[model samples]
Target: KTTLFCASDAKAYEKEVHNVWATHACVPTDPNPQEMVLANVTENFNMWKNDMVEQMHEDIISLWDESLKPCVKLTGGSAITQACPKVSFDPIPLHYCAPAGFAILKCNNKTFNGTGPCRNVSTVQCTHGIKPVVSTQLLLNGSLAEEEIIIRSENLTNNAKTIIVHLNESVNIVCTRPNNIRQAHCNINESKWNNTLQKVGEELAKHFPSKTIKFEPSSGGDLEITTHSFNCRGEFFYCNTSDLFNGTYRNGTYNHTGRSSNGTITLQCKIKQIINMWQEVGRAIYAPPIEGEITCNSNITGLLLLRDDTETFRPGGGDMRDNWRSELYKYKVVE
Candidate 1:
């Protein structure tokens, strides 16, 4: 006679079969019919048992191929591999006051991100490659203001762009004012031009939040605007003069003040381009395999597991026939 085991080992099955037959109390008065019935029952049991074993084998192989194969490769030899660090970037749209109104500022470069004030002026560095270098020009109105210019120098080691302008340093400039004269319809004083200068400074500060700004009127010199051509009595004149003017004017009434003249100042601004650099400090990886089980052991009055057993019985009456088997074979490696 031959015996077979399915999910259970041969030794365990033999013990189970012996127990089932040993517990049998009903006697077979006729030997042949009883023998035939026992034979058929054993055959039927073997059929289902073999089917379950075959399915279990297939399940193990399929699970290995589908899930465990890749994990094995990742853990075996390719543990330490090179990868492109997390490189993240986002669009930084600059704001510029166009002739129409405030609009998105477009410059030589279209790159930026992170938390900071986006400026019309920007400096970028590219690693050693065949990429073309981008040259940038920051403009006010349409032309560059020479009085305030951002001077930059290159770092030979890393090709870094450095703003070389020092604080409080003076620079040379060339300026011009509109010549067409319109006589003042009403009496005005230095306060009028002062108000205009204040407005301009406020607008600039709003646009360049990261910059430190200072405003001062240039010393009244020979530069002046004439209103005598219109020749209306008490008419005052103003002009754009002296390159030294820091957006300031005198604080006095100019009504009938003889030779009421104002110097045309070249309001100059000094700006520096700020740069921020970032790199990956390190990296993190995830890899493994396992089975998960949940047992509610907190309740002392609960008998959820006692009524759960069908073919297998654990101490808590839960089916755990293969639980130890799986745990014995489970393996993992993390990097």
Candidate 2:
């Protein structure tokens, strides 16, 4: 039998890597003083793309290839090895809304399971290297059933935010808004371009015990939609929606008064997919070599491009990335 590891097992896995002997010298990257922040950001960015990232993505792609393999003739009883990392990534580039919204975030806490290094590896699992990456679990067809979502609110009082939980799904807070925006409107539905506020509100009720949700309307002498504050700290929470699973927040950050204009954001864990599975010798295994060769689906896949809050009618400045200050909302946590 081959061994398997999960994406959450990364920190643990790193500890096991004792190959101190390196053939190449280390070279740190450095940019000019004016571009120092970008350089610094890149440094933090590299950690996500380490050995685990590469290995897991491959496992997934293999699953895609094997999904159709049965149609073609392939031979014999073979052993398979599959392993993936817990990773989160956005299929699309991130948008930067200057001033009002100036945060760049990506999927995180991506996890996957892998089984491999077998004999006569003929199964798709054996041939492609099927492993489960955390992000892929959220796919509707995927068994892992992980869910990634973000709830950004405006007129939020006392800085309180809670992510409604899902059943048989794992949720976590991987990244946060870089700057702050007053309101955040993101779509998480696969079949629709935008979800009605009532629809999302209804989904929110499903996770809450009462199956009832209430919000306080703003008394601005005008009809408005606002809800009573949860009075909880603003951050991400992971809830196990089924099987008596416990919901927890692995990592989280917050932004207040950051959103100025409406925009879309990748969920805490952005990239998600469902993989193929198979049974051999009365044993069940993943088909994608990684997970399933399923297309990456997201709770919120499309992001409405946000504009910089600069309020300048400057040409070619409609995009947020230009002149967007990453440090404006560098918040100071009260606690």
Candidate 3:
């Protein structure tokens, strides 16, 4: 797999992992064999952080599985890949903690330099209880009785549904997750049996987080361009495998300014929670390329976006810029 390095340390750590992994052929009886193997495992972690483009971390995971996993155990560095499962990215994989349990598995002193006292590899497991509610489905179009219809939850009144405005008005369904969870509570280092909240094809939010969704310029563009300001409002919803919703886009401003005399342009769009897409709500005619004779004096109206974005668009500082490889996959210039 190919990846564009986002940080100076990203490429540097990649080199270190490759170098250490090359030493995998070293036999356990060879001089400092454990040192070389453990180096492969430890160096990989040096590149990992909670925040970074997924391509970077996915590359790390691939390399770790490709090189370090086998070599570490072969040279007596402790990791037994078969004995312990490869942590799933498919769901709520319990994360590591301070003095991380899995981190030390790479370089436990027992296996360092072929030393004595072997330690068992850490097995990733989840002790389950009643998993907390991630989200709820609502059907407001229901034809109710003459009596005030009520939906109830006896466990927590916090989850109780009510109409503060007037009945028949659109009732807001906001997402809620408990903040009482700590790293230890997820069967982590502290080893507590708490089925702390989760995600896996889960509904992150009802609509796109307009404020947080960033519009990036093309990486290969000839001239420099920047977002002067944006007034993205209204709503845009994503189509998930399990649900459907209505869409109505309204009042939003997407402004872009090209460098020097290239000039600026402002465009507006309107959309609903559901639409077939591919329908252009607005367009602007710009000057031909190379001559750089573009006009900024026009105001194009209507609300439309290039991609279907959701609330989890930019979760946990993860960047999606690297995911946009094709011209059709992203929006920069509105033609």
Candidate 4:
């Protein structure tokens, strides 16, 4: 080993520099270290901020599509997307009361231009408890024919307690609802229900004509006050005392004996329950179209119908009130 060189001499300076280079392999020769450090820190901070902004944008898109868009569609003016900012008493996903029979979500405000302080948005609506209304329809051969009773209810008020309906004799009850839906029906027979007590109230019965029979004398005959008139299948007939005494018979076929002058018949009449029986004549035939050589009859005259005339067939000159026998004319035309 040689002796170490001193700094005062050139040999000593060269040895010191060599020893410093040997100790470190590769050292950075930066001009200003603080400025380089500051630049690196700024770049890292900018990258982090950019990543956070991108993430925030994604969250905002998700919120708008999933939540805010549905709210805007429900109530456009009052929705959070377009409406004014206000604190909500009940937060989002709140139920709004919809009208009865409507399944849509609606606002209570008259004008939806941010009229209220709070805004509510919901895809679903509150369950509107509608008190089911019962109505009567005349069903014909398993089909809806006529609406007999129109008992429509508003909200839940003024709903009928019991609905009375008149159905045809052959109609099968198809009004039974499934287990999921509410069931409502009227199973009373047409004949039995009309004559029985505990009748429907005057409000409902006013729609139908009164079941009535008037007692009087014959249209034209002896003044003995014995003969009575009967109308069956739109055909008129006159019956006397003997015809009604035995049983119900066709008035035209029954024979009439000489009226008693001195002997008083003394027919004791008692009021009975109201009942109607209908005889179905064949289906109505419409007048055929006439092409040529059609002769018009000037002798034909139109009849003036009265308010009391209830006959569906024939002109209205004859009245039912003229002759009404207790047993002979008990049944009246209903349909």
Q: Who wins the TM-score comparison?
A: 2
List the candidates ranked by lDDT, beginning with the highest: 2, 1, 4, 3
**What is the per-residue lDDT of model 1 for residues 1-335, given as tens digits with 9 covering 90 to 100?**
11111111113223232222212311212112111111111110111122222333333333222221221123333344333222111111111111222111112111211112233431111101110000111011111222332221122122222112111122222221222123112122334334433433343343334333343222222111110011001111222222222332122211111122353222322111111100111221312111121111110110101101011101111111121111111111101
TM-score of 2: 0.18
Q: Give the true-structure RMSD of model 4.
A: 42.7
On residues 1-335, what C-alpha lDDT tens digit does candidate 3 reach at each position?
12122111112223344333323411111121121132322221111112222442343344344432221132223333233222211111111111222121332322122112233322111111110111111221222222322211111123221111001222222211122110000001111100000111111111233432232231221110111111111112111111111122212322221121222111221112222111122211211121211111111111111222322111110111111110011101100
Q: In model 4, what lDDT does residue 97 have?
A: 26
- For each candidate, give its TM-score against the true structure: 0.14, 0.18, 0.15, 0.13
lDDT accuracy of residue 254 in candidate 2: 12
Worst 10 residues of 1 by lDDT: 126-135
lDDT of each: 0.20, 0.20, 0.19, 0.19
lDDT of candidate 2 over 52-145, digit per residue (tens): 3333333333432332222222225554444433222212111111122222222222221111111221111111111132221121111222
- Per-residue lDDT of 104 in model 4: 27
The total number of steric clashes, by the backbone 3 Å criterion, in model 2 comes to 46
For candidate 4, write residues 261-331 as lDDT tens digits. 23222222211111111111111111122222211111110111111221111111221111111000111
Clash count list over all predictions = 7, 46, 16, 0
